[PDB]
């Protein structure tokens, strides 16, 4: 039921506090990060082999 969980994420009806904002297209809703629409699991795969300047190591 991942397709039905990736579909109903930001459904706005009479109550907009029912939809849970999670991984936009990927999964692993927990053990990640959600605030600017970018889950660690998804971002890591989206930054695989250094894509968009986001996945780094440290360097202060």
């Amino acid at each position: 039921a991942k397709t039905s969980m990736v579909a109903k994420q930001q459904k706005k009806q009479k109550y907009a506090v029912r939809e849970y904002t999670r991984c936009e297209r990927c999964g692993r809703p927990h053990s990640v990060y959600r605030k600017f629409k970018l889950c660690r699991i998804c971002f890591r795969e989206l930054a695989y082999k250094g894509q968009i300047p986001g996945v780094r190591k440290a360097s202060w």
Binding site: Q13, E45, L46, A47, Y48, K49, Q51
Partner: protein
């Protein structure tokens, strides 16, 4: 990158499948193209809130139309 492509309708996903191949072509690496995605979904009707005959929740459909076009070797010029 193994990422999907959820646009709007059928032509919305068709123009997004050719636009993603253009941005990926800019970068100097292997690029893909067409992606088999066999049609598969369902539909159902119920009630809304006020008055609106049949077909509750004025929306297109519950189609899970998406894609899978992306880049293989992303470089510093892969951001554009």
């Amino acid at each position: 990158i193994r990422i999907r492509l959820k646009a709007y309708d059928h032509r919305v996903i068709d123009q997004s499948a050719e636009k993603i191949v253009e941005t990926a072509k800019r970068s100097g690496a292997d690029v893909s193209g067409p992606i088999p995605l066999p049609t598969e979904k369902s539909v159902y009707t119920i009630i809304r809130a006020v008055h609106k005959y049949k077909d509750s929740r004025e929306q297109f459909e519950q189609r899970t139309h998406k894609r899978l076009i992306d880049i293989v070797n992303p470089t510093p010029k892969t951001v554009d």
